[PDB]
Design a protein around this ligand. Structure first.
Ligand SMILES: Nc1nc2c(ncn2[C@@H]2O[C@H](COP(=O)(O)CP(=O)(O)OP(=O)(O)O)[C@@H](O)[C@H]2O)c(=O)[nH]1
Ligand SMILES: Nc1nc2c(ncn2[C@@H]2O[C@H](COP(=O)(O)CP(=O)(O)OP(=O)(O)O)[C@@H](O)[C@H]2O)c(=O)[nH]1
Ligand SMILES: Nc1nc2c(ncn2[C@@H]2O[C@H](COP(=O)(O)OP(=O)(O)OP(=O)(O)O)[C@@H](O)[C@H]2O)c(=O)[nH]1
Ligand SMILES: Nc1nc2c(ncn2[C@@H]2O[C@H](COP(=O)(O)OP(=O)(O)OP(=O)(O)O)[C@@H](O)[C@H]2O)c(=O)[nH]1
Ligand SMILES: [Mg+2]
Ligand SMILES: [Mg+2]
Ligand SMILES: [Mg+2]
Lengths: 426, 428, 426, 428
C-alpha cells in the first residue's frame, strides 16, 4: 500500500512542499516529524506516505531532486524540511537551462542514477508499493527532462505499480521560454507511453480561481500550489482513511482510462470560494456538485463543455449519504447529458470516504477526462511548429545532441493524441 | 563544477577587475583574501584565504602593474599576474606569434596548475577584445593550446566588438578578422559586445552623462556573473554550461549568441518602478536594451535563453513567454520549433557599492542566437575591404611574417559564416 | 423567514443606522451584539434579522454599501458599528457625483458584483428567505443608481422573494441637485418594474411632522430618520412577534397591490405628538386611528384626500381588542367613504399583534395606497422635462454613455404610472 | 486613491507653498518631515518622514531656491525641486518649447517615479498662471505628455486669470489664449481664479487693507484642500474626483466650473456671527464672494456642487437647497434639470497660525458651471484683438518660431468655446 513521491524541479519542489505540509496536517504530524494527532486513523495508514522513525517520528517517503542547490535549500529551510531526511536530497549544481536535452538526455541522467538507487532503497523499505507520484513541470529542464528520464527507469523496474504524475501545463499567457513548447513536446511524447496517468494543471486557470472565486488580488504560488495540493491529497484520502467507495488508485485508473493512450486528466475542486460568501454557504452535495461541475472551478485550463466526457470521477470527503451523492451525480449526467459521450452509460463514478478535510465538513475532488483537453495539446503543438519550422533555438538542443527527428516524432505522437480524442469525441 | 577565468589584455583584465570585484561582493570577500563564507571560483588555502582561480596576462607590464597596485592585489596570487615587456602594437602578428609566443608557455602552465587544482572543472571563460593585439592575437594562440590539452572543457569567450565610434586601431578589422577565424575554430561560444550600444544604455537607462569603461565593465561583469555564479549557486531551475552548448548551437558553426540585459535602470528611475518578470523580459526583447549594435527585429531567432535572479516564479515566466510569442515580433526559424530555455535561480541580484544601477529584486539575462548577428559581420567585411583594397598598413603584419593570403582567407571564412547564418535563417 | 437588509448611500446608511438601532432595542441586543433581553420572544424570531454568533452575540443580516469611505466609517464608529461584521462593509472611493450613470451604469456596478456575492453568502446562511429590504435615496448616485442595479440582480436571483425598499423622495423644497429629477426618473423607471413595493417618504413632510406635531424647532436627520425607522420596524413586528393578524409581508403585499404596477406607498404613524400634550393623551384605538388617518401624520408628502384610496393597511402593536380595532377602522371607511375607491369593499385591512413598542402601550403604522401619490410623480416628471428639453447638464450623463432615449423611455414609464393612478382614481 | 500635485512657475509654486503648508497644518506635519499621524498626499519613508507627493518646476532657479531656503525644504525631496536657468520671458514660445522642452523630460520622469510610488493614483492637480511663461507655456507642454502616459487619470488644473488690473505682461492675452486651447485639449477640469476678485473679498470680508499674494494664496489653498483633502478624509457623503467629472461636464467642452467660497470672514467680524449651513450657502451664491470676476446673476447654471466641512447636517442642506431654488435667481438651463450635488465631510475647517480668517465650524465650497464664464472669455478676446491688430510684440514669439496662424487659430478656438457655452445655455 505505499507510495513513493518525487519532487522534481522548482515546481515539483514547491508544490510538493505544500503537499507534504498538507499530508502531515492530515495525520497530525508536526514539522519535527512527531505525531500529535487526533485519531487512530491518522496513524492507521500513515505508512502510505511515511516511515516510522525511532521515537514516533515520521519520515516522508519522498525524494527531493533538482540541479540547483538553492531551491533545495530553500525547501529544506522551511517547515518540513526538518521532516525530510538528508538521504532524500539529491542535487547538482548547475541548472539545465530549461533544456530537456540537458536534463533528460545528458546532465540530469547523471543524477537520476543516484535518485533511482534511493528510490530502490525506499521501495525495499516498503511492504508493498502501490505506486509512485511525481510532481514536475512540463516545460522545465529537470521537471520535464530529468523527471521523464526517472519515470522511464522507474516504470521499467516496476511495471505493475501505478505511475502517476502531476504537472504544470504551459499556456500562452504564462510562457517563459521560447523553447518551452519544445520541452513540453518532448516530455509529452515520453509521458504518453510511460505513465499511467497525468494531471494537467494550468497556472492560468489557477490564477482565475484565485481571483474570481477566491477573491484574491495577488495570486501567489504559495496559494496556487496550495490548491494543487488539495487535489493531490484528495485522491488518496480514501486510501489513507476508511470509507465506502473506491479507495484504491488502481480502481480509479481502471474506471478512468477507456483507452491506453488517453490518460490525461482535468482536476477540479469544491468548495472553492472566498470567506466573504462562506457565511451564506450551505454545503450540500448538490452544492459541491454544482461547483465541481462548473468549469470555472477546474484547475485545468480547459472547459469540458467544449468537448465531451469520457469519464468523471468524483471523490467525496466527509459524512454524506449514499443517496444524496449517487442521486445528485447521476443527475449531473442527466442534466448535462449533451456533454457526455454515449459510449459509457453511467459516466460518473464516485468515491466516498468518511474523513473530511480539516476545516471543512465536506469536500469534493473532481477528476475529468474530456476530449476538450486536446486544446491544451493544440496550444503546445502549434507553438512548437512555428519554432521548429525555423529551427529557432534548436541549436541549443542540437548542441546537446538531439536529432530533428527526435522532435519530429515527438510531435507526431502529440498529433496522435489529439486525433484519438477526436475519434472518441464523436 | 568549477571554473577558470582568463583575462587577456587590458580589455580582459579591466573587465576582469570588475568581475572579481563583483565576486567579492557576491560573497563578502575581503581584499586580503579573507572570506568568511564560492568554490567555484575560489580555492582556499589553509590560512582561510581564498584565491581567485584566474590568470591575468598582459604583454606590456603596465596594466598588470595597475592590478598589482590595486586593493585586490592581495587576493591575486603573484603567479597569476603574468606580464611581458612590450605590447603587440595592436597587431595579431605579434600577439599571436612574434611576442606572445614567448610567454604563452608560462601562461599555459599556470593554467594547468589551476586545472590540477580543480577537481571537476566544467570549463573556463576568457575575456578580451577583438581589435587588440594581446587581446586578440594572443588570445588566438591561447585557444590553440587550450583546445589541445583540455579539449572538451567549456570554451566561453567574451569579446569586445569594435565600434565604429570607438576606434583605436586602423587595422582593427584586420585584427578582428584574423581572430574571428580562430575563435570559430576553437571556441564553444562567443559573445561579442559593443561598447557603443552599452554607452547608449548607460546614457538612457542609467542616465549617465559620461560613461567610462569602469561603468561599462560593471554592467558586463554583472551579466557574466548572472550566467555563471547563478549556475553555481543553486536555484530552482539550474542550467549548466553544457546545456547551453547543447541548446544554443544548432550547427557547429553557429556559436554566436548575443546578450541583452535588464533591468538596467538607475536608482532614480527605479523608484517608481516595479517590474514584473514579464516586464523585465519585455525589456529584454527591446533592441534599445541590446548590448550589441544590431537590430533584433530584423533578424530571426533560433535560440533564446532567459536566466532569472531573485524573485521569480515559473508560472510568471510561462506567461511572459506566451507574451513574447504573441507580442512579438520574434520570428523564429522553422528549423527550431520552439526554443526557449528557462533557468531560474534564487540568488538575488547584487549591487556594487558606489554603483550606478538600482537595487533590484529580480533580474533577467537574455542570451540569443539570431540572424541579426550577420549585420555586424557585414560591417566588418566592408571595413576590411577598404583597407585591403589599398593595402594600407599591411606591412605592419607582413613585415612581422604574415602572408597576404592569410588575410584573404580569414575574410572569406567570415563571409562563409555570414552565409551560414543566412542558410539557417532560411526556412525550410 | 429571513430578511436581508441593504443600506445604500448616506441616506441608506443613516436611516438604516437608526433602523438597526431600533431593531436591536426591540430584541434586547446591546451594541456589542450581546443579548440581554426581557423576553423569550425577543429571541424567538431574532433570526429574521440576525445571525447568532458564538457567545450569544448577534450579527445583523445586512450589508452596508457606498462609494465613500467616510460615511461608512462614521456609521461604523457609532453604536452599532460594533454589531456589524467587517464582511458587510463594501465600499469604494470616489462618490458618483450624484450621477445615476456613474452609480448604476458604470462605477457602482463594479462594487455591486462584490455586494451580490456577500448577499448570496448571507442568503445561503439563511434557512429560508422571506425577502429583502433596501434603504436608499431616489435622487442620489449610489442610492438610486447603484441600489437599482443591485435590485435588478437580486430580483433576478430570487424571483419569489419580497423586494421592498424604502426611499427618499425629492421635493421642491428639498432639492439639492439639478439632476436630481434625472436620477429620480431613471430610478423610478427601473423600480416600477423591479420591486414589489416601495415606500415614498418625503423629508418635507417629515420636517412638518417634527415641528408641527413634535414641536421641534430644529428638525434633524437624526430624528427624521428615527421616524422612518419607526415605520420600518412596525411593518415586521408581527413577523417577529406573535400576534393575531397578518404577520407576513407577502400577505400584506397581496392585500396592498391591486395592480402589478401600482406599488408605491404612503407610510404614516401614530401616536406622533410631543410630550407636552402627552399628559393629556389617552390612547385608544379611535385615538390612534384619528392620528393615522390624518394626512398631517403621513410621512409621505401627499394628502390622500386629494386622491382616492385603493388600499389601506393598518398595523397595530400592543394589546387591543378585536372589536375596537375592527369597528373603528371600519368606521374610518364609513365616515370617510368619499376618499375610498368603490371597487374595493372593505378597503381597510388590519394587522394586529401583541407586542407594543418600547415606551408605548399601543401603536399604529399606516400604509396607504392612494391615487394622490401621482402628485409626487408630477413634481418629478415636470422638473425633468424642463431640464431634459434643454439638455442642461445632460452631458454629464452622456459622458458616462447614457442615451437620450434611455431618459425618454424612463419618462414614458413615469407617465404611465400617473395615468394608471388616474384610471383607478376614477 | 492617491494624488500628485504639480506646481509650475512661481504662481504654481507659491500657491503650492501655502498648499503644502496647509497640508502640514491639517495633519500636524513637521517641516522636517516628521509626522505623527494623509496618505494621499504623502508617502512615508522608513524614517517616519513623510514626503509630499509633488513636483515643483521653475525654469528660473530663483523661486525654487526660495523653496530650498524655506522651512519646508526639509519636507521636500531634492529631486522634486527642479529648475532651469532662464525664464521663458513671459512667453509661451519658450515655455512650451524653446526652453521648457529641455527640462520637461526630467520632470515627467520624476512624475513617473511618483506615479510608480502611488498604488492607486486617482489623479493629479496642477497649479499655474495663464499669463506666464513657465506657468502657461511649460504647463501646456506638460499636459501634452501627461495625457499620453496617464491618459485617464484626473487632470485638474488651477489657473490664474489675468486681471485687468494686474497685468504684468503685455502679451498676456496671447499667452493665455495659446494656453487655453491646450487646456481644452487635455485637461479634465479647469478652474480659473481672478486675483482681482479675491482682493475684493479680502478687503471687504476679511477687511484687509493691503492684500498680498501670501494672503491670497492662503485662501485658495484652503479651497483646494476643501475639495481634495476632504475627499480623502472621509465623511458622510464622500465625493470622488471622478464624480465631479461625471457630474460637472455635460459635454466634452464645458469643463470650466468656477469657485466661490464662504465663510470668508475675519476673526473680528466673525464674532458675532454665526452662520448656518443655509446662511453660508447663501453667501456662496453671492457674486460678491465669487473668486472670479464675473456676474453669476447674469449667467445661467448648468451644474452646481456644494461641499461641506465640519458641522453640517444633510437636512439643513436640503433646506438650503430649497432656499436657493426659491430665492434665487439661479436660472438653470433646461438641459439639466436639477443639478445639485452635495458632498459632506466631517473634517472641520482648518486654521493657519497667523491667518487672516476666523476659526469656523463649518465651511462651504461652491463649484459651478455657469454661462457667465463666457464673459471673461470675451474680455480676453478683445484684448487679443487689440494687440494682434497692430501685431505689437509679435516678433517675440515669431522670432522664437511661432506661426501667425497659430495665434489666429487659438483665438478662434476660444471664440468657439464661448459659442458653445452660449449654445448650452440655450434652452431647448
Ligand atoms: N503552479 C506552479 N508552476 C511553477 C512553479 N515554478 C515554476 N513553475 C512553472 O514550471 C515551469 C518552469 O519550471 P521550473 O522551475 O520547474 C524548471 P526546473 O527548475 O524543473 O528545471 P531547470 O531547467 O533545470 O531550471 C513553468 O511552466 C513555470 O512557469 C511554482 O512554484 N508553481
Ligand atoms: N431623511 C433623509 N434623507 C437624506 C439623508 N442624506 C441624504 N438624504 C437625501 O438623499 C439624497 C441625496 O443623497 P445621498 O446622501 O444618499 C447620495 P448617495 O450618498 O446615495 O450617492 P452619491 O451620489 O455617490 O453621493 C437627497 O434627497 C438628500 O436630500 C438622511 O440622512 N436622511
Ligand atoms: N568594455 C570595455 N572595453 C574596453 C576596455 N578597455 C578597452 N576596451 C576596448 O577594447 C579595445 C582596446 O584594446 P586595447 O586596450 O587597445 O588592447 P589590448 O586588447 O588590451 O591588447 P594590446 O593591443 O596588445 O594592448 C577597444 O575596442 C576598447 O574600446 C574596458 O575596460 N572595458
Ligand atoms: N494667487 C496668486 N497669483 C500669483 C502669485 N504669483 C503670481 N501670481 C499671478 O500669476 C501671474 C504671474 O506669472 P509670473 O510670475 O509672471 O510667471 P510664471 O507663470 O511664474 O512663469 P514665468 O513667466 O516664466 O516666470 C500674474 O497674473 C500674477 O498676478 C501668487 O503667489 N498667488
Ligand atoms: Mg594593453
Ligand atoms: Mg517665474
Ligand atoms: Mg455619498
Amino acid at each position: 500500500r505505499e507510495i513513493v513521491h518525487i519532487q522534481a524541479g522548482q515546481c515539483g519542489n514547491q508544490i510538493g512542499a505544500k503537499f507534504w505540509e498538507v499530508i502531515s496536517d492530515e495525520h497530525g504530524i508536526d514539522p519535527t516529524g512527531s505525531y500529535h494527532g487526533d485519531s487512530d486513523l491518522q496513524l492507521e495508514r500513515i505508512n502510505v506516505y511515511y516511515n516510522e522513525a525511532a521515537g514516533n517520528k515520521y519520515v516522508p517517503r519522498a525524494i527531493l531532486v533538482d540541479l540547483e542547490p538553492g531551491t533545495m535549500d530553500s525547501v529544506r529551510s522551511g517547515p518540513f524540511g526538518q521532516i525530510f531526511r538528508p538521504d532524500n536530497f539529491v542535487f547538482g549544481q548547475s541548472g539545465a537551462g530549461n533544456n530537456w536535452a540537458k536534463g533528460h538526455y545528458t546532465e540530469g541522467a547523471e543524477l537520476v542514477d543516484s535518485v533511482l538507487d534511493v528510490v530502490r532503497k525506499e521501495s525495499e523499505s516498503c511492504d508493498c508499493l502501490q505506486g509512485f507520484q511525481l510532481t514536475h513541470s512540463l516545460g522545465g529542464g529537470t521537471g520535464s527532462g530529468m523527471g521523464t528520464l526517472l519515470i522511464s527507469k522507474i516504470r521499467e523496474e516496476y511495471p505493475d505499480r501505478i505511475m502517476n504524475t502531476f504537472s504544470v501545463v504551459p499556456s500562452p499567457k504564462v510562457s517563459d521560454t521560447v523553447v518551452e513548447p519544445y520541452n513540453a513536446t518532448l516530455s509529452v511524447h515520453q509521458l504518453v507511453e510511460n505513465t499511467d496517468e497525468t494531471y494537467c494543471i494550468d497556472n492560468e486557470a489557477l490564477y482565475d480561481i484565485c481571483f474570481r472565486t477566491l477573491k484574491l488580488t495577488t495570486p501567489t504560488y504559495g496559494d496556487l500550489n496550495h490548491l494543487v495540493s488539495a487535489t493531490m491529497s484528495g485522491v488518496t484520502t480514501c486510501l489513507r482513511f476508511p470509507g465506502q467507495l473506491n479507495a484504491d488508485l488502481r480502481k480509479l485508473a481502471v474506471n478512468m482510462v477507456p483507452f491506453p493512450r488517453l490518460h490525461f486528466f482535468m482536476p477540479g475542486f469544491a468548495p472553492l470560494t472566498s470567506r466573504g460568501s462562506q457565511q451564506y454557504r450551505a454545503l450540500t452535495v448538490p452544492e459541491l456538485t454544482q461547483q465541481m461541475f462548473d468549469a470555472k472551478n477546474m484547475m485545468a485550463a480547459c472547459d469540458p463543455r467544449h468537448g465531451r466526457y469520457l469519464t468523471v470521477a468524483a471523490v467525496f470527503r466527509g459524512r454524506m449519504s449514499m443517496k444524496e451523492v449517487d442521486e445528485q451525480m447521476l443527475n449531473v449526467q442527466n442534466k448535462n447529458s449533451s456533454y457526455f459521450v454515449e459510449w459509457i452509460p453511467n459516466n460518473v463514478k464516485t468515491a466516498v470516504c468518511d474523513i473530511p478535510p480539516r476545516g471543512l465538513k465536506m469536500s469534493a475532488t473532481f477528476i475529468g477526462n474530456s476530449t476538450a483537453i486536446q486544446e491544451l495539446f493544440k496550444r503546445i503543438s502549434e507553438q512548437f511548429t512555428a519554432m521548429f519550422r525555423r529551427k529557432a533555438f534548436l541549436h541549443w538542443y542540437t548542441g546537446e545532441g538531439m536529432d530533428e527527428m527526435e522532435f519530429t516524432e515527438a510531435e507526431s505522437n502529440m498529433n496522435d493524441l489529439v486525433s484519438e480524442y477526436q475519434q472518441y469525441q464523436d | 563544477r568549477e571554473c577558470i577565468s582568463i583575462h587577456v589584455g587590458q580589455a580582459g583584465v579591466q573587465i576582469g577587475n570588475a568581475c572579481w570585484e563583483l565576486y567579492c561582493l557576491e560573497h563578502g570577500i575581503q581584499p586580503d583574501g579573507q572570506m568568511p563564507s564560492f568554490n567555484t571560483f575560489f580555492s582556499e588555502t589553509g590560512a582561510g584565504k581564498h584565491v581567485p582561480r584566474a590568470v591575468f596576462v598582459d604583454l606590456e607590464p603596465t596594466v598588470i602593474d595597475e592590478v598589482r597596485t590595486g586593493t585586490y592585489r592581495q587576493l591575486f596570487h603573484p603567479e597569476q599576474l603574468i606580464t611581458g615587456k612590450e605590447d603587440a602594437a595592436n597587431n595579431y602578428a605579434r600577439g599571436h606569434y612574434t611576442i606572445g609566443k614567448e610567454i604563452i608557455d608560462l601562461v599555459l602552465d599556470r593554467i594547468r596548475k589551476l586545472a590540477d587544482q580543480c577537481t571537476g572543472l566544467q570549463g573556463f571563460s576568457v575575456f578580451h577584445s577583438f581589435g587588440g593585439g594581446t587581446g586578440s592575437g594572443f588570445t588566438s594562440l591561447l585557444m590553440e593550446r587550450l583546445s589541445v590539452d583540455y579539449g572538451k572543457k567549456s570554451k566561453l569567450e567574451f569579446s569586445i566588438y569594435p565600434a565604429p565610434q570607438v576606434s583605436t586601431a586602423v587595422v582593427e578589422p584586420y585584427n578582428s578578422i584574423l581572430t574571428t577565424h580562430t575563435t570559430l575554430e576553437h571556441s564553444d561560444c562567443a559573445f561579442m559586445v559593443d561598447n557603443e550600444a552599452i554607452y547608449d544604455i548607460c546614457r538612457r537607462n542609467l542616465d549617465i552623462e559620461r560613461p567610462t569603461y569602469t561603468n561599462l565593465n560593471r554592467l558586463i561583469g554583472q551579466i557574466v556573473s548572472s550566467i555563471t555564479a547563478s549556475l553555481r549557486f543553486d536555484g530552482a531551475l539550474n542550467v549548466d554550461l553544457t546545456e547551453f552548448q547543447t541548446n544554443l548551437v544548432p550547427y557547429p558553426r553557429g556559436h554566436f549568441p548575443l546578450a541583452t540585459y535588464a533591468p538596467v535602470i538607475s536608482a532614480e528611475k527605479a523608484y517608481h518602478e516595479q517590474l514584473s518578470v514579464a516586464e523585465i523580459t519585455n525589456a529584454c526583447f527591446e533592441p534599445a536594451n541590446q548590448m550589441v549594435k544590431c537590430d533584433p527585429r530584423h533578424g530571426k531567432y533560433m535560440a533564446c535563453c532567459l536566466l532569472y535572479r531573485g524573485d521569480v516564479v515559473p508560472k510568471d515566466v510561462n506567461a511572459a513567454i506566451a507574451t513574447i510569442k504573441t507580442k512579438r515580433t520574434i520570428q523564429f526559424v522553422d528549423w527550431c520549433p520552439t526554443g526557449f530555455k528557462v533557468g531560474i535561480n534564487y540568488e538575488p541580484p547584487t549591487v556594487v557599492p558606489g554603483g550606478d544601477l538600482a537595487k533590484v529584486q529580480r533580474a533577467v539575462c537574455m542570451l540569443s542566437n539570431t540572424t541579426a548577428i550577420a549585420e555586424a559581420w557585414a560591417r566588418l567585411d566592408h571595413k576590411f575591404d577598404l583597407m585591403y583594397a589599398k593595402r594600407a598598413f599591411v606591412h605592419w603584419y607582413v613585415g612581422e611574417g604574415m602572408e597576404e593570403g592569410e588575410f584573404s582567407e580569414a575574410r572569406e571564412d567570415m563571409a562563409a559564416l555570414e552565409k551560414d547564418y543566412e542558410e539557417v535563417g532560411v526556412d525550410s
